[PDB]
Amino acid sequence: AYARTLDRAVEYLLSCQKDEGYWWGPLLSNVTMEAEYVLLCHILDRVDRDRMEKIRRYLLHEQREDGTWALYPGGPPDLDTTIEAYVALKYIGMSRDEEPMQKALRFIQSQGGIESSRVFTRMWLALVGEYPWEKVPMVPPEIMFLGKRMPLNIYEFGSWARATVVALSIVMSRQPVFPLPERARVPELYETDVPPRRRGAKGGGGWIFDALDRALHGYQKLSVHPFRRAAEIRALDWLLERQAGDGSWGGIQPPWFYALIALKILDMTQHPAFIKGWEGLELYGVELDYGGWMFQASISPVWDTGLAVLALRAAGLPADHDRLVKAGEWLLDRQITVPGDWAVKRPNLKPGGFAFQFDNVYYPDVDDTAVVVWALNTLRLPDERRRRDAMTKGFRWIVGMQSSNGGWGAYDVDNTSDLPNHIPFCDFGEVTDPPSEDVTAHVLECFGSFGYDDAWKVIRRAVEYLKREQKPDGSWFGRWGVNYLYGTGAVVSALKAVGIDTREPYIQKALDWVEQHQNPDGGWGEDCRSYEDPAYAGKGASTPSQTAWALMALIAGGRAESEAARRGVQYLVETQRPDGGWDEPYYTGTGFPGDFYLGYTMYRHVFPTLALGRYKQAI
Amino acid sequence: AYARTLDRAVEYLLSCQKDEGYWWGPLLSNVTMEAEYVLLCHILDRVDRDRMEKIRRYLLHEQREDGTWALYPGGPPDLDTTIEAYVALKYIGMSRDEEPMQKALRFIQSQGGIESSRVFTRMWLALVGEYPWEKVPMVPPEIMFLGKRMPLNIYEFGSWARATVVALSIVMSRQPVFPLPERARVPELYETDVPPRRRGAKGGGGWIFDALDRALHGYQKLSVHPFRRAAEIRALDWLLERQAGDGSWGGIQPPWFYALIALKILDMTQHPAFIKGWEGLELYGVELDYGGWMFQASISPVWDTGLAVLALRAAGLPADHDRLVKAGEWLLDRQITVPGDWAVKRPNLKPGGFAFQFDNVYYPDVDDTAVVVWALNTLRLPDERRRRDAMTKGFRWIVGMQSSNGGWGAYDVDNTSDLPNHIPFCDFGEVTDPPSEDVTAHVLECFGSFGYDDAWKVIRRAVEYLKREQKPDGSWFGRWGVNYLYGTGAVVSALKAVGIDTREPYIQKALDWVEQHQNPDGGWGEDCRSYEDPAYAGKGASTPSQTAWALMALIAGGRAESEAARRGVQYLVETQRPDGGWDEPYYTGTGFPGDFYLGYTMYRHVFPTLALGRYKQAI
Ligand SMILES: C=CCN(C)CCCCCCOc1ccc2c(-c3ccc(Br)cc3)coc2c1
Ligand SMILES: C=CCN(C)CCCCCCOc1ccc2c(-c3ccc(Br)cc3)coc2c1
Ligand SMILES: CCCCCCCCOCCOCCOCCOCCO
Ligand SMILES: CCCCCCCCOCCOCCOCCOCCO
């Protein structure tokens, strides 16, 4: 029945593998990357007419009928995103009249204008001089002086926020302005009557931070700020030290862009770090066939390759397949062997993790490290010596990274401070990196492949963690994947791997929940709205990926021979394309619950293959 | 008569000009660059068999009949140089028997072995584990803590020493060892009876420093050194901030190599700066036609271009000659506009100088800046706006760089501290950058071209300086050129340009001295020995360059219609080659009086052309 489906999928994936041996699908996000790029280019005075053109086509192509852009396909119009896409287009050339410009503009206004947008958006505008700097939450260079164990020192923030903050303190310190030509001025973003409905800090705003901020803008005005020179240089140095090998900073769009703006501010455009930072950008861009151009929020080579391998193995290929070997060898060369920021809380921990992108040594993550080590574990590479050793180093690093609550975070250990969530600046996405059910789950399944079970105290503390986090209806949240279907699939699959008993009440209470959400069409789906409003948990148009996740939960829970089970396998077998792949016009990846979603291009092909491989296994 | 010589020199120079518009002859030094390269490669575990081969050819090619190598062609055998060339060859493959290895080994031994070599040499050996680190003068990371106005803070050293020290403190801090394979071990360098005649600090050693060194070696042994981690990071940061655009540090071989070793030490080979540092190296290498390969101590593009222009103009070409315009435009794009280390002593001075190499913004020098600004002054470029502007910024920067005594140093203002000259480490070349007669002279001739004269207080203080420095016999020392002929030519030419009266006693006393040294052949020459022993001042085989310098002195002093004058012009006319160039198997450039000499490849062609142009002018 499905056997042909699997064979078509296996050969499809294999054709997607690059020559070097890895897989790498693009990462989709939203138009703020490209819009911010255009502004970045203006700031750096490096505008390429031809590129601007490709970016316009893309911006438009992404606008919907109503004239707005969203955070995810088929999602509500987003104001920040739309405001930025708007300014970008006006800069590139479009007059405020044009049909597209008109719709967007009115959407923007009906929302309360620019005054209703997030900090970043108003800040970007502040940079080109279309918004007052005084109204932008202040992050001072001096933050650089807080010690390792002090409130709000840069290590209390999550890895992604940390670098962005450091980079920004240099910029906010100078509050620079790079004027837009008159043609692109956007005063009309203020022309509205609607009350400006302002978004506040992620966790709530104590009047302290509010006062403190007012203080800082006050202090900004003084004619002299002692030790500020040093605070700046501390920040600059912090950055020079961590620049990734591709020229980026963290391998993510924000800090990278800001770090470049900061360098420009410090007259360092003639410096190596800048040059390398600037030209590294091309590697993240993507030429779209319809003549457009997009910029990736980040890149997922390692991750893509790790999963690809696991799926192809579960599907049936030999642990020594000359093609999976290319992958294994490649993965071995990726292992990070030097201390990263994680070592501030684990100085005696030997380096052994892996990063998400190609070359980003200071920020390996537990998720990638667990998937890579595990996928390696399932292979037979020529140099069993290195495979043995690498797995070992990786294994140890993971174990050492476990947090207090028994669960793993992504980049740090106990990065659970609640302080940062209340600052006036932090009104967008996550700002700290606490442990999550999905990473913890993946870690568990990794150990599981080795044998380690419930006996080992490590695994026990984790399961304890998971049990305490389970939801009333039996589901598990999805921090990095959309959403409860992602988490629940991850957890149950994990628990099953570490020997727990699938028959337990809480396990069954989950397996039921899965079955109860199956869509009429035989597959499963969960819209991104499920982060915003609970009515959507387990609800949404079916996707190949989310179906594969729900299936894994079932197959792990013994219900592989169920109705819902076979029904789902039907859905995957049917919807498969003639080439062997699948389609997925929806995002199933999570950047930040509620604020940033991602489209993992390979998911639609890898998870179905993985779930089908595990089904063929249960028979 | 000479006119044909002049036309042949002109067309020759023009044929040497690169397409971009500049001139760039290689800079010759000695084999320690290549020998140290080989060791650097071994340390960085990046040995390329083919390159080693080209290097071996070169090293032998440079060895003399006695089996030794020297600091300059036709110079005495140098121990340090020979010891390093020796180890290099043994590493590359040659067995200690071979004719060459034999001769060298006995020379080295007859000198007292390795114990008689400079700090650097023993240090390099310490790095590959063939010499004890305890016996190597110590330079601690903590030096990084000394303030701007404290004894021995890094800004009391000359620019070149400064970066080398900073880079080295990280290395000496870890006292790393990268073992040589048994084949290349060199114990035989100890096998000698001759008493080790040790070289001491350049200025004598106070028992204090000796004590201090012994202290620092003991401190090294302790199990804990508080704040050392920081000193290291202060150093690394100091380094990361100043990396030049080509990946070098300062555009000179020493700090560059050391900075790379330090990053290797700090597990930063995967960092941008390291990679940029490593690949930048190729730009300094040179393929020799006989299959050898050499590495330049530094590169002289700007300098070469600046002089080339002045010579071609003095020769006759139109101030708007399209070929001289390519040069002018190119020179304008070179001007440094950001603060360098010089700003520590001149914070309110607007950037406007030029560097010696292509891209080295933090270290412009007064010599290049005076020659470039002056050459620009003699051209009519399309964008008179920028030429007017560049000259002014440059001019002002020079004026602002003037030191206390009224003369100019090369990179800093009053870098005259005598302290650094007494440390156990500083036993090679210059370590501070005090004002010199030749740079001062060039600066003067630069102002002269604008019309400024003896009336202006700045020029007066300089002439005062020069007069006070003149030698008893009427000659002027040559800090950056070999030697009294170079200086005297520079000063008299300068004084003549700022309006001083050539008839004065001291001027005549010099012009006489010049005539007094003319060789039987009609030209002038001065061997590099003239730094070591005074009997050689103004004596040596005639060279096209030194003849040209003596000529300029005469032509500036009015004796252009003299015997010695016409006689000299004959020499240049006769010895010219058919293509229009000249030959010069001797070095006429000075790195450090007594310790490091340079072969400026373009000198032989540019100065004769410049002197002949000024002769044709005096008629
Ligand atoms: C399933 C597993 C995935 N894991 C391997 C983790 C790697 C996926 C994360 C890639 C998302 O890239 C980003 C990261 C941060 C941002 C931000 C941002 C927002 C607020 C602050 Br303050 C700082 C940064 C914006 O876009 C991003 C994209
Ligand atoms: C006419 C004008 C030339 N001027 C424009 C000045 C530029 C020429 C200098 C190039 C010489 O390059 C170097 C510099 C330093 C060293 C060292 C060294 C010795 C001791 C310490 Br402590 C540190 C470095 C060795 O070789 C060099 C070559
Ligand atoms: C250079 C001194 C050595 C200090 C590094 C040891 C690391 C100690 O853990 C602190 C964590 O700091 C994170 C550093 O990674 C960034 C790059 O720093 C470069 C070289 O150390
Ligand atoms: C970050 C504030 C800028 C402070 C430096 C300007 C002050 C003058 O320089 C003092 C000495 O440093 C000179 C060296 O230039 C090297 C790199 O500095 C680059 C970024 O500041």
Min Cα–Cα distance to chain A from B246, Å? 8
Based on the domain organization, do A12 and A59 belong to the same domain? no
Neighbouring CB atoms inside 10 A of B566's CB total 15
How far apart (Å, rounded) are the C-alpha atoms in residues B368 and B299?
13
DSSP secondary structure string, B565-590? HHHHHHHHHHH--TTS-----S--EE
Q: State this model's resolution in angstroms.
A: 2.7
Q: In the beta sheet, which residues pair with residue B600?
A: B27
Q: Are B141 and B226 in contact (CB under 8 A)?
A: no
Based on the domain organization, do B293 and B323 belong to the same domain? no
Pairwise CB contact (< 8 Å): A243 & B270: no
User: Which residues constitute the domain of residue A217?
Assistant: 27-298
Based on the domain organization, do A48 and A149 belong to the same domain? yes
Q: For ligand 1, atom 17, which residue shows the shortest CA distance?
A: A254
Quote the crossing angle between the two packed helices A563-575 and A603-617, to the nearest 10°: 140
Min Cα–Cα distance to chain B from A231, Å? 14
Q: Which CA distances in Å does A517 have to A473, A495, A541, A565, B599?
A: 12, 21, 11, 12, 82
In 3D space, the residue among B442, B422, B439, B420 whose CA is nearest the CA of residue B431 turns out to be B420
Write out the E strands in B58-111: none
Min Cα–Cα distance to chain A from B267, Å? 7
In 3D space, the residue among B279, B33, B47 whose CA is nearest the CA of residue B180 turns out to be B47
Based on the domain organization, do B138 and B158 belong to the same domain? yes
For ligand 4, is residue B241 a contact (CB within 6 Å)?
A: yes
Based on the domain organization, do B277 and B344 belong to the same domain? no
- A338 Cα nearest atom in ligand 3: 15
Phi, psi of A322 (to 5 degrees): -50, -20
Q: Are B513 and B474 in contact (CB under 8 A)?
A: yes
Residue A87 burial by CB count (10 A; 0-12/13-18/19+): exposed, middle or buried? buried
For ligand 3, is residue B262 a contact (CB within 6 Å)?
A: no
Min Cα–Cα distance to chain B from A160, Å? 19
Q: Which residue, chain included where needed, has tokens 């053109």?
A: A53
DSSP secondary structure string, A91-122? HHT--SSTHHHHHHHHHHHTTTGGGGS-HHHH
| Joined tokens for residue A266 | 């410090």
For ligand 1, is residue A411 a contact (CB within 6 Å)?
A: no
Based on the domain organization, do B224 and B369 belong to the same domain? no
Maximum CA extent, chain A: 77
Based on the domain organization, do A20 and A31 belong to the same domain? no
Into how many domains does chain B fold? Answer: 2
Residue A48 burial by CB count (10 A; 0-12/13-18/19+): exposed, middle or buried? exposed
Q: Is A95 on the interface with B (CB under 8 A)?
A: no
Min Cα–Cα distance to chain B from A165, Å? 20
Torsion of CA B310, B314, B318, B323, to 10 degrees: -40
For ligand 3, is residue B266 a contact (CB within 6 Å)?
A: yes
Q: How far is CA B472 from the centre of its chain?
A: 27
How far apart (Å, rounded) are the C-alpha atoms in residues A275 and A257?
13
Q: In the beta sheet, which residues pair with residue A41?
A: none
Residues of A in contact with B338 (CB under 8 A): 267-268, 270
Interface of A with B in 322-341 (CB under 8 A): 337-338
How far apart (Å, rounded) are the C-alpha atoms in residues B465 and B474?
14
Catalytic residues of A: 367
Pairwise CB contact (< 8 Å): B267 & A338: yes
Q: From the CA atom positions of chain B, what is the Rg in Å?
A: 24
Q: Specify the amino acid at residue B227.
A: F
Pairwise CB contact (< 8 Å): A272 & B270: no
Q: Which residue, chain included where needed, has tokens 């940079």?
A: A127
Residues in chain B, how many? 619
How far apart (Å, rounded) are the C-alpha atoms in residues A340 and A331?
19
Q: In the beta sheet, which residues pair with residue A252?
A: A298
Pairwise CB contact (< 8 Å): A361 & B273: no
Neighbouring CB atoms inside 10 A of B256's CB total 25
- B428 Cα nearest atom in ligand 2: 20
Q: Which CA distances in Å does A466 have to A406, A451, A469, A493?
A: 9, 20, 5, 13
Phi, psi of A225 (to 5 degrees): -125, 100
Pairwise CB contact (< 8 Å): A272 & B243: yes
Based on the domain organization, do A162 and A194 belong to the same domain? yes
Q: Specify the amino acid at residue B479.
A: R
In 3D space, the residue among B548, B437, B538, B547 whose CA is nearest the CA of residue B494 turns out to be B437
- A254 Cα nearest atom in ligand 1: 24
Show the DSSP H helices in A380-436 as ranges: 384-401
Q: Which residue, chain included where needed, has tokens 């290689």?
A: B26
Peptide bond into B405 cis (omega under 30): no
Ligand closest in space to the Cα of A346: 3
How far apart (Å, rounded) are the C-alpha atoms in residues B616 and A400?
81
Contacts 24+ apart (CB under 8 A), B574-582: B574/B522, B575/B523, B575/B544, B576/B5, B576/B8, B576/B9, B576/B608, B578/B8, B579/B8, B579/B12, B580/B8, B580/B9, B580/B10, B580/B11, B580/B12, B580/B13, B581/B9, B581/B12, B581/B605, B582/B544, B582/B608
Residue in B240, B242, B263, B338 to test binding to A, most A beta-carbons within 10 Å: B240
| Joined tokens for residue A483 | 């959403």
How far apart (Å, rounded) are the C-alpha atoms in residues A493 and A590?
20
Q: For ligand 4, atom 4, which residue shows the shortest CA distance?
A: A229
Mutational pocket test of ligand 4: of A229, A239, A271, the residue with most ligand atoms within 8 Å of the beta carbon: A229
Q: Which residue, chain included where needed, has tokens 């991104």?
A: A528
| Joined tokens for residue B143 | 């030096």
How far apart (Å, rounded) are the C-alpha atoms in residues A246 and A46?
20
Strand ranges of the sheet holding B589-592, from the earlier edge strand across to the other edge: B27-28, B596-600, B589-592
Based on the domain organization, do A204 and A320 belong to the same domain? no
Q: Is B108 left (phi over 0), alpha (psi -120 to 50) or beta?
A: alpha
Pairwise CB contact (< 8 Å): A275 & B245: yes
Per residue, the 3-state secondary structure of A254-321, as one string, reads: HHHHHHHHHHHHCCCCCCHHHHHHHHHHHHHEEECCCCCEEECCECCHHHHHHHHHHHHHHHCCCCCC
Pairwise CB contact (< 8 Å): B272 & A271: no
How far apart (Å, rounded) are the C-alpha atoms in residues A346 and B475?
67
Q: Which CA distances in Å does B407 have to B345, B395, B436?
A: 16, 15, 7
Q: How far is CA A439 from the centre of its chain?
A: 13
Neighbouring CB atoms inside 10 A of A472's CB total 6
Residues flanking ligand 2, CB < 6 Å: B 160-161, 164, 252, 254, 297-298, 303, 356, 365, 367-368, 410, 428-429, 431, 480-481, 591, 596
| Domain's final residue, options B298, B320, B347 | B298
Phi, psi of B50 (to 5 degrees): -65, -45
Neighbouring CB atoms inside 10 A of A515's CB total 20
Q: Are A600 and A606 in contact (CB under 8 A)?
A: no
Pairwise CB contact (< 8 Å): A241 & B237: yes
Based on the domain organization, do B401 and B437 belong to the same domain? yes
Residues of B in contact with A270 (CB under 8 A): 245, 338, 359, 361
How far apart (Å, rounded) are the C-alpha atoms in residues B599 and B590?
8
Torsion of CA B235, B240, B242, B247, to 10 degrees: 130
How far apart (Å, rounded) are the C-alpha atoms in residues A378 and A201?
45
Catalytic residues of B: 367
CATH code of the domain containing A22: 1.50.10.20
Q: Are B126 and B205 in contact (CB under 8 A)?
A: no
Based on the domain organization, do A213 and A314 belong to the same domain? no
| Domain's final residue, options B298, B326, B360 | B298
For ligand 3, is residue B240 a contact (CB within 6 Å)?
A: no
Based on the domain organization, do B129 and B194 belong to the same domain? yes
Question: Which helix (H) or strand (E) is B57 found in, with range?
Answer: helix B49-62
For ligand 1, is residue A298 a contact (CB within 6 Å)?
A: yes
Closest residue of chain A to B236, computed from CA coordinates: A241
How far apart (Å, rounded) are the C-alpha atoms in residues A232 and A240?
12
> How many contacts (CB atoms, under 8 Å) link A and B?
49
Phi, psi of A145 (to 5 degrees): -85, -20
Residues of A in contact with B275 (CB under 8 A): 245
Distance A597 CA to ligand 2 centre (A): 56
Q: Are A443 and A387 in contact (CB under 8 A)?
A: no
Experimental method: X-ray
| Domain's final residue, options B298, B315, B335 | B298
DSSP secondary structure string, B473-516? TS----SSBSSHHHHHHHHHHHHHHTT--TTSHHHHHHHHHHHH
